[PDB]
Amino acid sequence: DEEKMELQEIQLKEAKHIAEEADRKYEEVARKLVIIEGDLERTEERAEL
Amino acid sequence: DEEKMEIQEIQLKEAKHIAEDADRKYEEVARKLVIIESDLERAEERAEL
């Protein structure tokens, strides 16, 4: 049981490591998307004017 | 030790599931951004005309 517990803890640490990049990429994509949306809004308003 | 086994097992499985859900939420926004960018380019051309 002790050896199985150690290896399971190592696997859990690896999965917890992977989830961080998996989230922070989505963070960056949202940060890009909001700027793109703002640019679209102001361009449309300029054309209407 | 067996109690610690089942605790860490359910912890690891929940972490894997939430990572998969984060990956799907990543997957949608790419094509969302692509179509928004295409609309931005079209609006810019209209403004230039």
Side-chain angles (χ1 to χ4, degrees):
Chain A
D1 269 17
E2 194 170 52
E3 186 169 3
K4 200 168 189 183
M5 171 175 168
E6 301 216 350
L7 62 92
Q8 277 277 356
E9 180 181 354
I10 288 183
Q11 177 179 348
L12 174 61
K13 262 200 181 181
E14 194 159 331
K16 183 59 168 65
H17 203 285
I18 296 299
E20 201 149 13
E21 294 86 5
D23 199 4
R24 186 281 320 151
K25 294 202 179 314
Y26 167 73
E27 291 178 350
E28 190 265 328
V29 174
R31 293 213 74 259
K32 188 66 64 68
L33 180 69
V34 56
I35 305 304
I36 285 297
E37 175 64 42
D39 291 20
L40 166 65
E41 176 196 42
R42 51 180 39 83
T43 316
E44 190 268 331
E45 204 270 332
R46 165 179 191 153
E48 181 260 358
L49 174 57
Chain B
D1 212 1
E2 184 163 319
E3 162 197 0
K4 183 61 169 316
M5 280 315 178
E6 64 96 19
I7 289 168
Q8 58 84 19
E9 180 264 339
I10 184 62
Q11 181 67 257
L12 177 55
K13 196 261 194 160
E14 171 195 359
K16 200 166 207 163
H17 185 267
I18 202 68
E20 186 261 329
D21 263 344
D23 283 331
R24 173 175 169 262
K25 284 194 171 192
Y26 195 71
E27 185 66 30
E28 182 187 40
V29 194
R31 74 177 185 91
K32 190 72 176 295
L33 168 61
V34 167
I35 58 171
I36 289 310
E37 161 192 3
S38 176
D39 277 2
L40 164 64
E41 172 188 16
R42 200 212 63 81
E44 162 192 5
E45 291 280 15
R46 186 171 198 168
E48 206 175 87
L49 181 136

